[PDB]
C-alpha cells in the first residue's frame, strides 16, 4: 500500500517546472525511510534481548 | 415596568426577620430578572420608546439583561463572607448592591447624555463604600482614592462639553431628537470638545495609559471575590462611547487615530505583565484590560462590523471575567491568601470544580462559538478594513490569550498541596451554583446570539 500512496508522489514530482534542489532534498528523504524503520526492527526487536528484569 | 420593583426590593431586606434575609433578597430578584428577558427583547424597525424620558428604551442594549442576571449572582457569592458580621449591617449592605443595580437599570435604559452622566457618576459612590469597607487587605484606601481620582478628573470635563453642545445645537436630551447633527469642521476649539467627551470613557474603558484604576480595585478587592462582579459592570458601564462617537462627532475622527494606537500597545504590553504576577486576582485584572481594549479599538474605527463585535464583547466579558473572579473567590475562602504558587492542586481535593475551571478559562480563548469568538472575530475582520498590518499586532494577542488560560490551569493542575491542611470539604451547593449560573447562559448563547450582538442586526 506504500506504492499506491508514496510512489505516486515521487514519480509526479520529477516531471515539473519547479525547483531542482527542492526535488533533490525530497529524494534523499525517500531513501531515508529505510534507516529509521530498521531502527525499530534491528535495535528494539531483532538480536539479543535487553529487557532489564528478574522476571 | 422596571421602576419600583428594585425600589420595592429596598424595604424587603429591612422588614424581613434575621433568620431569613438571604432567602428573600435572591428569590425576589430572580423573578424580576425573568421579566427583563420577557419584555425588553422586542424590537421594531428602529429604536422604540417605553415611556417619557425618566427611563427611555433599548437600541442596542441586551447588556441591561446581564445586570439583571447579576442582580442575584452577587448575593450568591457573598455567602461565606458576611456570615460572622452584624445582622443590621447585612441589611445595610444588600441595599447598597440594590442601589448600584438601581442606577445601572437607569443608565442603560435612559437614552440621554445629561441624565445618563449624573447616574453614571451615581454608581461611583456605592462602589466607594463597598470597596473601602469589608476589604480583606490593607491599603484599601488607595483603591478608594484612585477610584475617584482617575474617574472624576476625566468625567467632570463632560459638564463643560455636553452643556456646550446643547447650547449650540438644540438639545441632547432625547437622542432620537438629536439628528440635527452638523458635521464637525475640525478646528482647534473642537479638539478639546472631542477629547473631553472621550477622556471620561478612557478611564472606565482601560487603555494602556490611565489603566492603573482597574488592577488596584481588584487586588484590594471590595469583598474577597464577590463584589468584583460590580466592577465588571463598571467596565461595561463605559457604553456611552457607542453613543458619543455615533451621534456627537461622526466627521472628525482624525483624533481617534492616536487613541487606537495607544490601545494597540494596551493589548500586547498589558498581556505581557499578565504572565509573571503572583496574585491570582491580578491575573484576571490585567487580562480584563486587554479584552476591554478590543472595544476601544473597535468603536473608534466606526465601521458597522466593529459595533457588532463590540456589543457582543460587552456581554461576553461581563459573564466570562466575572466567572473567573468566582473561581478566585473559591480559592481565597479556603487559603486566605491569593498567591498562585501557594494554592496549587486541583482534582486531588476539587474534582468537579476542575471542569468548571476549564469552561471559564478556555472562554478567554476563541472556543466553539460561545460569544467571545463572535465578539473577537468581527473586530479582527473590522481592523483589516481599517489597515492590513493590524493582524500582525492582533495575532500576538491571540498567542498570549492561550498564555492567560493554560497558565491559570497548569499552576492549578500541578498535584501537590503538601502544606495545605484546609480545603477538606469540596464545594457547597451554592458554590457550584455560581459556576453553573455564569456558564450555562454562555452555553445557551452558543445556539442563537441574535439578541446579543444587535446594533441593527
Amino acid at each position: 500500500t506504500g506504492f499506491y500512496s508514496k510512489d505516486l508522489i515521487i514519480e509526479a514530482a520529477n516531471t515539473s517546472y519547479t525547483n531542482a534542489w527542492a526535488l533533490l532534498m525530497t529524494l534523499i528523504a525517500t531513501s531515508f525511510t529505510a534507516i529509521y524503520s530498521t531502527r525499530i526492527i534491528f535495535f528494539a526487536l531483532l538480536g539479543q534481548p535487553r529487557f532489564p528484569t528478574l522476571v | 415596568k422596571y421602576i419600583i420593583p428594585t425600589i420595592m426590593l429596598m424595604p424587603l431586606t429591612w422588614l424581613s426577620k434575621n433568620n431569613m434575609i438571604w432567602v428573600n433578597s435572591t428569590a425576589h430578584s430572580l423573578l424580576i430578572s425573568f421579566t427583563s428577558l420577557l419584555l425588553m427583547n422586542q424590537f421594531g424597525d428602529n429604536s422604540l420608546n417605553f415611556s417619557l424620558l425618566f427611563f427611555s428604551d433599548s437600541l442596542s442594549t441586551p447588556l441591561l439583561i446581564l445586570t439583571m442576571w447579576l442582580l442575584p449572582l452577587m448575593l450568591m457569592a457573598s455567602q461565606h463572607h458576611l456570615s460572622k458580621e452584624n445582622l443590621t449591617r447585612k441589611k445595610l449592605f444588600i441595599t447598597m448592591l440594590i442601589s448600584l443595580q438601581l442606577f445601572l437599570i437607569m443608565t442603560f435604559t435612559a437614552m440621554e447624555l445629561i441624565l445618563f452622566y449624573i447616574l453614571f457618576e451615581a454608581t461611583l459612590v456605592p462602589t466607594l463604600i463597598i470597596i473601602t469597607r469589608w476589604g480583606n487587605q490593607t491599603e484599601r484606601l488607595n483603591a478608594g482614592l484612585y477610584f475617584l481620582f482617575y474617574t472624576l478628573a476625566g468625567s467632570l470635563p463632560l459638564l463643560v462639553a455636553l452643556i456646550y453642545i446643547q447650547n449650540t445645537v438644540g438639545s441632547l436630551n432625547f437622542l432620537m431628537l438629536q439628528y440635527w447633527v452638523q458635521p464637525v469642521h475640525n478646528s482647534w476649539s473642537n479638539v478639546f470638545m472631542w477629547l473631553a467627551c472621550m477622556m471620561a470613557f478612557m478611564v472606565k474603558m482601560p487603555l494602556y495609559g490611565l489603566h492603573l484604576w482597574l488592577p488596584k480595585a481588584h487586588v484590594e478587592a471590595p469583598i474577597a471575590g464577590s463584589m468584583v462582579l460590580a466592577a465588571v459592570l463598571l467596565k461595561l458601564g463605559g457604553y456611552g462611547m457607542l453613543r458619543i462617537t455615533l451621534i456627537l462627532n461622526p466627521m472628525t475622527d482624525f483624533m481617534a487615530y492616536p487613541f487606537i494606537m495607544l490601545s494597540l500597545w494596551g493589548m500586547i504590553m498589558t498581556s505581557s505583565i499578565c504572565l509573571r504576577q503572583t496574585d491570582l486576582k491580578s491575573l484576571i485584572a490585567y487580562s480584563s484590560v486587554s479584552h476591554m481594549a478590543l472595544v476601544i479599538v473597535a468603536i473608534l474605527i466606526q465601521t458597522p462590523w466593529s459595533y457588532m463585535g463590540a456589543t457582543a464583547l460587552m456581554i461576553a466579558h461581563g459573564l466570562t471575567s466575572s466567572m473567573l473572579f468566582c473561581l478566585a473567590n473559591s480559592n481565597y475562602e479556603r487559603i486566605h491568601s491569593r498567591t498562585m504558587i501557594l494554592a496549587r492542586g486541583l482534582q486531588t481535593l476539587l474534582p468537579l470544580m476542575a471542569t468548571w475551571w476549564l469552561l471559564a478559562s478556555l472562554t478567554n480563548l476563541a472556543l466553539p462559538p460561545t460569544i467571545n469568538l463572535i465578539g473577537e472575530l468581527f473586530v479582527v475582520m473590522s481592523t483589516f478594513s481599517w489597515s492590513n498590518i493590524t493582524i500582525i499586532l492582533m495575532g500576538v494577542n491571540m498567542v498570549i490569550t492561550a498564555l492567560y488560560s493554560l497558565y491559570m490551569l497548569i499552576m492549578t493542575q500541578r498535584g501537590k498541596y503538601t502544606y495545605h491542611i484546609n480545603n477538606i470539604s469540596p464545594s457547597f451547593t451554592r458554590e457550584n451554583a455560581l459556576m453553573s449560573l455564569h456558564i450555562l447562559p454562555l452555553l445557551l448563547l452558543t445556539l442563537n446570539p441574535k439578541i446579543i450582538l444587535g446594533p441593527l442586526y
Binding site: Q48, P52 | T348, Y417, I421, S425
Partner: protein, 166 residues
C-alpha cells in the same frame, strides 16, 4: 566530602555508558576498561593529584555528555514517568468523608480513628522528645531519632509514616 565526589562521578559514568553502547556484552567490556582507569589511581594516597585527576575527569565525560541519557524506568526527573500514574489523595481528604457514604467499608473508618487517636495522644511526648534534642538555638542539620524510646512513637511522623504509595 572527596570520597562522595569520586563515587558520584563513577555512578554517573556507568549509567551514561549504556546510552553510548548497544548490547550488554559490549557494556561489560567498557565497564572493565573504566575499572582499569579508576582502581589503579585510587590505590595510592594523593592530596593535590587526586583533585587534579577529578578535574581532568570532567573531560572525556564532557566530550561524551549528551546522546540523550538512558533514564528508562521511573526515575526522579529526566524522562519516562517521573511522577506519573498518581492520583495521590492525602490524609487531609480522608477525614472529610460525607455521612451516609462513609459507612461503606467500616473497617477502614474504624482503623483510621485508632491511628488518629494514637497521633493525638503521643504528640505531647513527641514535642518533649523533639524539643529536648537541641545543640543551642537551632539544629545542626539532620532529623531527630528517638533516644529514650520506651513505649514508642518517634518525634515527627505522619507524612513520613503515611505515604500514598505508587
Amino acid at each position: 566530602t572527596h570520597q562522595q565526589k569520586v563515587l558520584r562521578l563513577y555512578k554517573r559514568a556507568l549509567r551514561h555508558l549504556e546510552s553510548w553502547c548497544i548490547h550488554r556484552d559490549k557494556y561489560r567490556y567498557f565497564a572493565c576498561l573504566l575499572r582499569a582507569r579508576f582502581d589503579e589511581h585510587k590505590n595510592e594516597k594523593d592530596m593535590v593529584k587526586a583533585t587534579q585527576l577529578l578535574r581532568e575527569a570532567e573531560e572525556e565525560f564532557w566530550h561524551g555528555q549528551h546522546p540523550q541519557p538512558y533514564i528508562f524506568p521511573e526515575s526522579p526527573g529526566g524522562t519516562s514517568y517521573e511522577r506519573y500514574e498518581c492520583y495521590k489523595v492525602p490524609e487531609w481528604c480522608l477525614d472529610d468523608w460525607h455521612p451516609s457514604e462513609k459507612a461503606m467499608y467500616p473497617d477502614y473508618f474504624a482503623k483510621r480513628e485508632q491511628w488518629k487517636k494514637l497521633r493525638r495522644e503521643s504528640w505531647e511526648r513527641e514535642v518533649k522528645q523533639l524539643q529536648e534534642e537541641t545543640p543551642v538555638g537551632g539544629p545542626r542539620t539532620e532529623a531527630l531519632p528517638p533516644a529514650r524510646k520506651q513505649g514508642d512513637l518517634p518525634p515527627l511522623w505522619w507524612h513520613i509514616v503515611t505515604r500514598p504509595r505508587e
